[PDB]
Design an enzyme around this catalytic site. Structure first.
Site: not given
Ligand code: R9A
Ligand code: R9A
Ligand SMILES: [Cu+2]
Ligand SMILES: [Cu+2]
Ligand code: NA
Ligand code: NA
Lengths: 620, 620
Positions: B288-290, B292, B295, B297, B299, B371, B374-375
């Site tokens: 994982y190039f977190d 590149g 991105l 920033g 997240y 990501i 990871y945090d």
């Molecule tokens: C590279 N590797 C090893 C890797 C391994 C695994 C995954 C991966 O990918 C990279 C991920 C990037 C970092 C990680 C993702 C980057 C962030 C993008 C984001 C979001 C994303 C994914 C979600 C989600 C989210 N929410 Ru969430 N929520 C629910 C389910 C899935 N939400 C989003 C859309 C529709 C509905 C909801 C929802 C519904 C009820 C409760 C919570 N949510 N949300 C909405 C409103 C307010 C607050 C939230 C919230 C707060 C904490 C967690 C989730 N949500 C906010 C921001 C990479």
């Protein structure tokens, strides 16, 4: 009632009394070292016997003695006359410090040397420096100090700015005779002052720093009982103090659920040496064993609140003996406080919606000592997550010389005409291990790279290997930073829930070890400093990597002699001795007073616990 | 009015407007990257031209474009269609994350695989993971993500506790087709939960932690002007933010008397990669190039007061583009505070009677990103004494697998049946140097041991050597901890008062570099990670050690291609690229949520100043 309690003033005056009553402490006697002995292995069952060890010097030139006293029973357990030419001279006495300058001030050779440089003898300070062991046969069996000269222009002047190079003297501090005065030629005495409180040099002080206030409105989270027993966030230990080693930690253990689990039985800095790398005959003999020769505990500073130690501080005030056996308190000599240490653990989970953050903290136990120009802070840290760390903070004023016309391969320039000889500060941490008890072993762990081929077709695999150190002959190890080398101390009879031996991993900084030629006097006297890690079988008389008597003592004692016994260390009561240090090429920024630089090591749990030990830490 | 100011919401909507007006941002277009470009060299004289760089993806399968826009002038400077099979795919889009799971949920092969393991498809989470470049010729020129499965027993369950090993799928996220489903056999899905907020697992929370309160009753000692210009204790800098790199420091300079002296023109973490060392075909493609590919920033977490950042905190709230070009604020995404850093300098002088103690402080600028599992915390530190430091704090939940029956050389056990594949986290810091201006050079400094003999009769001397790196072909360097190797960046045309070139010394931690076989895909894609230090001649288009487009991009770009130009770096505008990382063999203590571990580097002044720069720090 703890047998690990600090020495009290009463106990020291009682040792004095016992020695006097026994005829061992008449008016010509001086105590060069005095400390409480640790309880014997398995002594918990039997009642307390507080024993004290004493090195007694004789100012009339009689042989010194090593004496063990039982203060509980009011008896002398043993007294033996030392032959110092064989086993070493006693540590330098505080009272001998002034003697070098005093004797030199009426010596015609010294006066001739000062007159050749137009230096007023009343303004010449002489540093009383340990002599080591070189080619001067007359010094064998004699208490010698060597003197280097520094000019002090007025009472409050920093003499270190004005070294008198090309001149060194040797003095017998018992017979009170100057044995040699060596003058290799005049060098300019650097003229600029190094007065770091003089407004001329500092300029106007900054008015830009706004207060930082650190408070604990409910007090600290640690408790102190029995004077020196600490309990903090599952940790348990006793804070000892010894005039040689300084702060010593005893019985470091962690309360995991309902069980108090030992980790380290005794932790100390058992030696520290400062070898100099300038081949000039004026300084080529210079190696200060601050711990072994000077006794770092004896010079511990009284630490001021909001200044040396910031926050809600609990102090200990250890008691030591003066030269006559009277107790002397080092007021506020040990600082104890907890402090915030940023984020402990954090995860914001996309699938569960749970955001989780927890803060870290560490317990800090420290002291600061001053040895001439050097000041060192010794810090021990215990972290919420089970990590144990040591850090040394080096500051003070750099030891100076002239800076030669045409430069130097072994000295840096700090100011016009002012030099700082290259040197190292090298520590030995003695870690009497008790991982879940005393049955321990050490493995060396290296990263293992793997070749692309069958079983690894994409060429991504990597692994690691562990080699058990089975006997002392195999337990003298060097660093290998490139292969990520560490050392794991485990208990082969205590397994975690996954059926793996519990352990702690030692992470070194992998700084250079002793640079001196292996045939030098210092390579032999500080043999420990030539290798990063030693493992010995525990013995009660193997306390220091340099032996009991370091002053003017050749090789023959210490770690190289201990490991020759080639004892079993595979599931036994063992001791790890880790060498770590700073290699200092002084920079202009170190002058006129040095900003702190650091070195240390840490140990982290390695399958010691059955899961993270900080799941029960609360939010916010 | 600073050309280094953060991007405003207005500027982002204006880029959107310009692109729309130009016909480059219709309804099928998505912004995969958008960031402000730094001003050109020597641009200070001319008026501001705020330029933005944009990578535009097309959801209908058309070729993406790289576009540069002048937001000041409302124009498109350049637009070029990319051939992704050649130069690389665009970064993963947030909107593609859900797509892997969604597509797989109606694929018959995937459903058959889940049914063989008695797993309810509604409970199977699929991680959308970067694909890299391996043997699958059909993937060339296609946007692929690979999916690994984790079971979530209920909405708040940590799915990472329940990896589904032996199964991996590949998906085309544009055509929305499942290309391959690989099932190598069933492994037991680990059953224990990893719910670190469940009282069953944590037990009763500790009640032993008493409050620590850190306050600044007069506010902080730093000022913020123009949104992001910091002035603190003689330091001056601008805090930038980029969706790829995260926090970027610009114009780091120190006010020495009346002169503002540049030190570093631009500092960033220009890449970070997490290579996995498990040869199983289920994970052997995982890197994982977190920075590149994902991105970092984008997240960045919104950081909560008294929780993520403790003390008197000043926040910045950087603005980024969403996929359609609308501005989105990361509220409280950057923390800024100063904190006490123990003793700065200390000396108690026997001859002068003067006791002197001063406290250290550091300015902290940080952010935290998430990501997947990871945090990471990214921390920049500026110290009173001129030291500059970076530290990365790694935490989150470990990436899991099954633990094989009979063990593994490449995976550790965390819990019954639960494995953690070995991996590294490797960072590249890009330091566009400006030591007293742009005319700089780098020397490699090694400790030099000396033999006992003529000129060194006591065998105590040691020295050092410096080798100037004159051209890029000679500027790819490895660590040597044993010889205390460091690298000094100096300005050969700017001398201190002692006639020596001013400089800063880079001190690395000397952790292992990339372990993968040199013939692997990852050794080529992350070539930077194979060596500790690279030096290039500055060029505007040499931004990342892996090139502009990392996703599914083979070797061909990045550092190895930059240095082939073999340009002069001896007294020129140069850039240092330092590789540093953690090699992680997960321990039981890392489960179910990992305590922070750290890695970093620092640079300390080396004859930059004419004496200590902290003589004017006041007492208490
Ligand atoms: C590279 N590797 C090893 C890797 C391994 C695994 C995954 C991966 O990918 C990279 C991920 C990037 C970092 C990680 C993702 C980057 C962030 C993008 C984001 C979001 C994303 C994914 C979600 C989600 C989210 N929410 Ru969430 N929520 C629910 C389910 C899935 N939400 C989003 C859309 C529709 C509905 C909801 C929802 C519904 C009820 C409760 C919570 N949510 N949300 C909405 C409103 C307010 C607050 C939230 C919230 C707060 C904490 C967690 C989730 N949500 C906010 C921001 C990479
Ligand atoms: C190994 N290397 C490289 C090395 C290089 C150089 C030296 C050296 O030796 C090791 C030294 C050990 C650490 C370093 C020495 C270890 C400490 C032993 C101590 C003391 C010692 C030496 C003093 C002195 C002292 N005082 Ru200080 N005083 C003045 C002059 C010289 N004094 C002492 C005796 C008689 C008169 C005074 C006096 C008079 C007026 C003002 C200050 N003094 N004194 C007295 C009362 C209250 C407070 C003080 C005081 C406070 C700060 C400094 C000095 N005095 C207190 C404690 C080693
Ligand atoms: Cu030093
Ligand atoms: Cu990791
Ligand atoms: Na032991
Ligand atoms: Na540059």
């Amino acid at each position: 009632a703890s047998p690990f309690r600090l020495a009290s003033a009463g106990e020291i005056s009682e040792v004095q009394g016992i020695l006097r009553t026994a005829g061992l402490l008449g008016p010509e006697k001086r105590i060069a070292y005095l400390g409480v002995l640790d309880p014997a292995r398995g002594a918990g069952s039997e009642a307390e016997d507080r024993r004290f060890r004493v090195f007694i010097h004789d100012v009339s030139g009689a042989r010194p003695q090593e004496v063990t006293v039982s203060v509980t029973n009011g008896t002398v357990i043993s007294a033996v006359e030392l032959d110092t030419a064989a086993t070493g001279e006693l540590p330098v006495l505080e009272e001998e410090f002034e003697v070098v300058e005093q004797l030199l001030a009426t010596d015609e050779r010294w006066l001739k040397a000062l007159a050749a440089r137009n230096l007023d003898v009343s303004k010449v300070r002489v540093a009383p420096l340990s002599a080591g062991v070189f080619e001067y046969a007359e010094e064998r069996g004699r208490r010698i100090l060597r003197g280097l000269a520094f000019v002090q222009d007025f009472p409050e002047d920093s003499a270190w700015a004005h070294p008198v190079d090309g001149l060194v003297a040797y003095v017998d501090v018992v017979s009170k005779e100057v044995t040699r005065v060596i003058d290799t030629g005049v060098f300019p005495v650097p003229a600029e002052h190094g007065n770091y409180t003089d407004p001329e040099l500092t300029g106007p002080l900054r008015t830009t720093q706004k207060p930082i206030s650190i408070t604990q409105p409910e007090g600290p989270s640690f408790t102190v009982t029995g004077g020196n027993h600490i309990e903090w966030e599952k940790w348990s230990l006793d804070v000892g103090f010894d005039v040689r080693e300084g702060v010593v930690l005893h019985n470091i253990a962690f309360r995991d659920g309902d069980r108090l689990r030992p980790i380290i039985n005794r932790a100390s800095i058992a030696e520290m040496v400062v070898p100099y790398g300038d081949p000039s005959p004026i300084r080529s003999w210079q190696n200060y064993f601050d711990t072994g020769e000077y006794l770092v505990g004896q010079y511990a500073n009284s630490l001021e609140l909001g200044c040396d130690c910031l926050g809600d501080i609990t102090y200990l005030s250890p008691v030591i003996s003066d030269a006559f056996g009277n107790p002397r308190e080092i007021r506020n000599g040990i600082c104890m406080h907890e402090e915030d240490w940023g984020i402990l653990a954090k995860h914001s989970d996309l699938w569960s919606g749970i955001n989780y953050t927890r803060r870290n903290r560490r317990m800090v136990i420290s002291f600061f000592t001053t040895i001439g120009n050097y000041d060192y802070g010794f810090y021990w840290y215990l972290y919420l997550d089970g990590t144990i760390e040591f850090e040394a903070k080096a500051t003070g004023v750099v030891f100076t010389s002239a800076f030669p016309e045409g430069g130097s391969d072994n000295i840096s320039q700090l100011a016009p005409g002012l030099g700082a000889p290259f040197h190292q500060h090298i520590f030995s941490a003695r870690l009497d291990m008790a991982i879940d008890g005393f049955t321990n072993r050490v493995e060396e762990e290296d990263v293992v790279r793997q070749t692309m081929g069958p079983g690894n077709e994409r060429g991504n695999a990597f692994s690691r290997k562990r080699t058990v150190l089975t006997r002392e002959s195999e337990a003298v190890r060097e660093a290998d930073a490139r292969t990520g080398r560490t050392w794991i101390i485990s208990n082969p009879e205590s397994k975690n829930r996954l059926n793996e031996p519990v352990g702690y991993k030692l992470h070194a900084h992998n700084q250079p070890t002793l640079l001196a030629d292996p045939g030098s006097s210092i390579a032999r006297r500080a043999a420990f400093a030539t290798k990063d890690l030693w493992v010995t079988r525990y013995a009660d008389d193997e306390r220091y990597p340099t032996g009991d008597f370091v002053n003017q003592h050749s090789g023959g004692a210490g770690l190289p002699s201990y490991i020759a016994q080639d004892r079993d260390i595979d599931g036994q009561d063992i001791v790890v001795w880790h060498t770590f240090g700073l290699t200092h090429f002084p920079r202009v920024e170190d002058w006129p007073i040095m900003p702190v630089d650091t070195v240390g090591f840490k140990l982290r749990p390695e399958g010691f616990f059955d899961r993270s030990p900080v799941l029960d830490v609360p939010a916010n």
